[PDB]
């Protein structure tokens, strides 16, 4: 159904993997990605796939006569650009306002003046905390203990704030102005080309480089993890099935406390599992996150295909493993960078 | 009393001046500061009389970093009226809502982070969305959710309400990751001296006084939830002098009409005929009912309003209109020619 889409935030972690879905699964399609480069972006994740089904336009989503030039020659926009770490929205917020709101804000005039389709996608960070599974009188599976599209917004952190916010100009756009915008919101991903200053993959890489992999407060938290590959179909199935003006939310059944995937993560690579440090916690950290995606399946027939979290995990070690020089460059400068707010628990 | 040096946004304008006029009248210990950019809507004649030692007049932007700080560094408290207000500007043009409503909002925010002082945000019923008519509802608008409380979900329909509710959540997140001492409100419909006459009421008490007809959206089936403005000064005081940090607070005087029982009103008082307005080109995305239940501030910090007979506010509205007719005579002509640019009888 479409033949010239541009994917914002191509060059990223969960942007790449769906530029490779398409080049991989639909090749009929030509892909204009859209991506800044800023620290997160990189072009070895799309070097490789570069030529006459993708190409790569450097610069900013709020560069109106750039997004302008683009837009007039697509047929789609799927946009994935944003500044995306909970940690750094705590040091600094400037670019979370420019980029998630006033991007999108960009990006969603461009779409109403050429009419043409949007997806934005989103996280289930939207809508606040729940209660751990233990503290709930239907542990986890009765109403409202879980996430659903009928839950309240109300996002924790500068971060969330500004993809909410985000969210709320596509939904009035869609009213106001007949747009024609889908939204996803989708739980924790992982796997291959994650940056290494998010949980799982700088455990992984501390280890693979002899440093001690790091804990926030005493490993509580819960997190729902989905594999990409499971992110990007969701993505294609909205895109080209979904109803105009809909939320739908992604997610694969995968709750797991911070503790207990570490000592995954240790046990899969031989460590013992006492061999890491506890370090200062995050401010108004989020506890427990968990998606009901009924919606999503019901509707539009998706099903997830990587549900067994131990496989995934050791498949993603593995890559980790084999692409050192993915990472290594960035190894000590993330490292220093967390050690001016984070240290050690004693 | 607790505040003694404080600064209003927006308070040249319809509500942020009759708040100033609220605290020279009620509290003599508190010096303001009022910082106002003076758009079209902001008059420096609705603080004129009470400009001098203890009122300031300030002239610029809430974006204004270094303006913001400058005043910040001085002040005990900020309460926040300034916006872009109007729903049709909003559909219009889009982007001064999205500058003052959310950036300033923004910049705001980090003046009272960097200063540790309190911070009250003014907001709106229109962040949650529409309600049905109350012959459509099964208790009548009686019933849980037949009415708006602080757990109601934000689902904003315009560029106005959508860039409202996001300042709102952001707000929420300051408080939680970064410990502002920050309250909000949102209230319903206000009306009284001193509004702008592109709004539903003083436009048609106007245009009677000049000599063009009133006005009315489609058949006036909508519903609003009229409140005078004296009203919302006194409930703003006590949430920012008594409420409990981080909470939401709702403002509502129980006082529901649909508009064109409203506009027969005003032509009944000043003598005109029943059928002596035009139907109109009715608003894209029109919200239908709006509806407040205020007994969380009733309950809780012990509000009250004192103006619930709507016929003698009105009254005196019209009043205060026919006898101040030199405040506005000089912008008619301009507000019905921008409205005659998207408007035509039907
Ligand atoms: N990672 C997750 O678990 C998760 C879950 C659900 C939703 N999301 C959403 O998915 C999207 C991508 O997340 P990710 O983890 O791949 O992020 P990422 O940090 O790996 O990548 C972000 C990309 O956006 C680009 N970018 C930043 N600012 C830009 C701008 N102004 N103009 C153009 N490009 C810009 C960067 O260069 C980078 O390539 C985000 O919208 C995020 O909110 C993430
Ligand atoms: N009018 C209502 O029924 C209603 C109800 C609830 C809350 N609100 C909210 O109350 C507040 C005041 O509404 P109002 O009806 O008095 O609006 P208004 O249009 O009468 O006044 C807006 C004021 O803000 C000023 N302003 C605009 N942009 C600015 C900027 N960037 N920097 C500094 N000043 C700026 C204008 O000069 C003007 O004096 C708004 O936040 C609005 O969302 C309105
Ligand atoms: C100007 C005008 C309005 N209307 C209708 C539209 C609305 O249903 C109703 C009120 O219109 P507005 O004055 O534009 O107010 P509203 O859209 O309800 O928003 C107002 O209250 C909520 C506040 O947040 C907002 O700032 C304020 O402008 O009357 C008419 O029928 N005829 C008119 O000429």
């Not at 924790?188 to 994650?194: K, R, S, T, V």
């Not at 240790?266 to 006492?274: I, N, S, T, V």
């Amino acid at each position: 159904q479409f033949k010239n889409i541009i994917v914002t935030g191509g060059a990223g972690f969960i942007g790449s993997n769906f530029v490779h879905y398409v080049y991989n699964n639909h090749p009929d399609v030509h892909v204009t990605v859209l991506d800044k480069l800023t620290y997160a972006g990189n072009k070895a994740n799309l070097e490789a796939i570069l030529g006459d089904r993708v190409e790569l336009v450097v610069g900013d989503i709020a560069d109106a006569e750039l997004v302008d030039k683009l837009a007039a020659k697509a047929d789609a926009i799927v946009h994935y650009a944003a500044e995306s770490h909970n940690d750094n929205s705590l040091n600094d917020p400037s670019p979370f306002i420019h980029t998630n709101f006033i991007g999108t804000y960009t990006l969603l005039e461009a779409a109403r003046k050429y009419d043409i389709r949007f997806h934005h996608v989103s996280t289930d960070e939207v809508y606040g905390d729940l209660p751990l599974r233990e503290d709930l009188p239907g542990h986890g599976e009765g109403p409202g203990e879980k996430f659903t599209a009928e839950t309240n917004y109300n996002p924790s952190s500068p971060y969330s704030s500004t993809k909410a916010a985000s969210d709320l100009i596509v939904k009035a756009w869609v009213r106001s102005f007949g747009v024609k915008a889908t939204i996803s919101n989708c739980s924790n991903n992982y796997g291959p080309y994650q940056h290494i200053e998010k949980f799982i993959p700088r455990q992984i890489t501390n280890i693979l480089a002899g440093i001690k992999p790091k804990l926030y407060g005493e490993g509580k938290n819960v997190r729902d993890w989905i594999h990409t590959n499971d992110h990007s179909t969701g993505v294609w199935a909205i895109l080209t099935k979904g109803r105009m003006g809909e939320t739908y939310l992604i997610g694969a059944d995968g709750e797991k406390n911070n503790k207990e995937v570490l000592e995954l993560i240790l046990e899969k690579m031989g460590q013992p599992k006492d061999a890491y440090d506890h370090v200062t916690d995050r401010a108004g950290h989020d506890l427990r996150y968990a998606i009901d995606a009924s919606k999503l399946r019901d509707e539009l027939g998706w099903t997830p295909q990587f549900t067994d979290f131990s496989e995934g995990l050791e498949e993603t070690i593995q890559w980790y493993t084999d692409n050192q020089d993915w990472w290594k460059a960035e190894k000590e400068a993330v490292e220093a960078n967390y050690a001016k707010t984070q240290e050690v628990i004693k």
